[PDB]
Amino acid sequence: AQMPSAGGAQKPEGLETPKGANRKKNLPPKVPITPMPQYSIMETPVLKKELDRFGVRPLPKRQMVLKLKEIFQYTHQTLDSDSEDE
């Protein structure tokens, strides 16, 4: 709901990057900033399989990315745990 000000403080200018160029897969539970680990920007081979598994119809990558981004926005509560949710 809120953020710990004594722990946040640092003004963001960019956070939501393609998870790969840096060694940063996590998102610190602190301040509600636009999430970096978007489901819609996951690695192409596995994400294509996850796109099929989630049951998404063939919409072009612009229409598709907005769909799975929006879905991810209301689904994003904590962070990707690497392991499957037990």
Side-chain angles (χ1 to χ4, degrees), residues 59-72:
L59 284 304
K61 179 54 66 69
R62 201 288 183 153
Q63 218 292 330
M64 168 283 177
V65 76
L66 297 184
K67 180 169 280 58
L68 283 301
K69 179 179 176 60
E70 189 75 281
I71 296 173
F72 179 74

Side-chain angles (χ1 to χ4, degrees), residues 14-48:
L15 188 280
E16 29 53 79
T17 65
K19 180 191 295 185
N22 286 318
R23 298 299 73 207
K24 186 195 83 307
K25 63 81 51 180
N26 66 327
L27 190 286
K30 191 61 55 58
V31 53
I33 300 303
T34 308
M36 175 282 301
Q38 295 174 88
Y39 206 91
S40 53
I41 70 176
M42 294 295 91
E43 189 183 87
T44 303
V46 61
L47 179 57
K48 183 181 61 181

Side-chain angles (χ1 to χ4, degrees), residues 39 45-56 68 84:
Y39 206 91
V46 61
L47 179 57
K48 183 181 61 181
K49 179 60 63 177
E50 297 301 272
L51 194 64
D52 185 83
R53 182 189 58 74
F54 191 69
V56 183
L68 283 301
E84 300 297 273

